[PDB]
Amino acid sequence: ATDLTEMVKKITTMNRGEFRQITLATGAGKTTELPRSVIEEIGRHKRVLVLIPLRAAAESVYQYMRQKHPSIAFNLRIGEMKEGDMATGITYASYGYFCQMSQPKLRAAMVEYSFIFLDEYHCATPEQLAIMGKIHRFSENLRVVAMTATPAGVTTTGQKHPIEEFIAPEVMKGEDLGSEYLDIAGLKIPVEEMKNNMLVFVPTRNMAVEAAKKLKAKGYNSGYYYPSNLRVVTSQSPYVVVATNAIESGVTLPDLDVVVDTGLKCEKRIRLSPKMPFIVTGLKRMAVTIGEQAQRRGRVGRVKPGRYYRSQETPVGSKDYHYDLLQAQRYGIEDGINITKSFREMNYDWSLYEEDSLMITQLEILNNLLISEELPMAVKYIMARTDHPEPIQLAYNSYETQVPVLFPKIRNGEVTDTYDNYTFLNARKLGDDVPPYVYATEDEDLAVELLGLDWPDPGNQGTVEAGRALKQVVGLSTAENA
Hints:
Blueprint: H1 4-12, E1 18-23, H2 33-42, E2 48-52, H3 55-68, E3 74-77, E4 90-94, H4 103-110, E5 115-118, H5 126-136, E6 143-148, E7 163-167, E8 181-184, E9 187-190, E10 198-201, H6 205-217, E11 222-225, H7 228-235, E12 240-243, E13 258-261, E14 264-272, E15 279-287, H8 290-297, E16 306-310, H9 322-328, H10 339-350, H11 357-370, H12 377-385, H13 392-397, E17 405-406, E18 408-411, E19 414-419, E20 428-429, E21 439-441, H14 442-450, H15 461-480
Helix pairs in contact: 1-2, 5-9, 5-10, 10-11, 11-15
């Protein structure tokens, strides 16, 4: 914390229009003690903002801090826009709170803070990405500090005992392995490890259940997660629990010995092409980050020494924020702002994320299309009220169709007579008439293929031109390759 005085002195000497990126653990007083030291240095009646991804996390820090430091004023902004707000202490807000204001309102609000702390920036949530790109637009008027706990790689964790690291080989097409090894999540693990308390990390919800039943069939005390039910399994040692990445999220495992990590996870990803639909989104099995691998390994070696079995799968450096960046675009529609351009411009100055230039380029071309015309009021309303998980799909598609279509759900790899229905859409079923979608889902595309149907081609100048622009951009990437 001697080094905290250094950080504080560096932050507090900052001039308007300046930026600092800081790396320090959560238990090192990031989110908390840093902004506290800064306000104590600059004056308690000055205003300092701390942006937190989760509303819950914001409220939790607010409570903790106001009780721990009663001489410093504290504010919480996770609800409705507090008009003309001028609260003097430290304000703990969510990025989503500032997403309610127009650019001018946002700027007027933001310039009134002496310092702006962007907490947990590599979570890269859509609200986070939109706010950072948006405020960067007037960064000359601000003093901003981006804080992180564990940046791009092992990583920073709560280890107290040593962890034995192992590389488990992948199981080969029905290989024999009797009385010595067992197949758990596609990995060859010694049967001796079943005498210990196990946690198995798996990507899909289906894999977590399928491997749990196979282990119970083999006579092991197995469970699955994707908490009271596991509590039952967890009471008897030895236990094996097959859980998704969602396991870590406040669920307890008593006296855990061994972790088996498949190295995989299921996340939303995007594909872009010059052929319409230019955008197709869907869940996809991918590799976990070095940070996520460290979180998985970190579940052991806390109270007793651990054992970590990992797959041959190599972890990725940074998280893939392209899907969240696409979702973030929604926050510039009313203002006529290209969120993709703002992100790119902010990142150039702040150097917070790794970049995929072809993808940013394509996302930016499409973003220009998204804001090329005022959104129909009808669409604005649906997007505001639907429980549809990706309302921006509605905004993009409106450049071709105003009628949402219901594509038959895909169970296994086959087309069902099941449909997904969300509120306010007032949709029609696919039938055999494929809509001219600019933005589609992996499954909407699959149904189209399985049914032997075809996606229409650009029906207007703007859409035809976005396609040609995308084709041109891809042409260079391909030509550059060799």
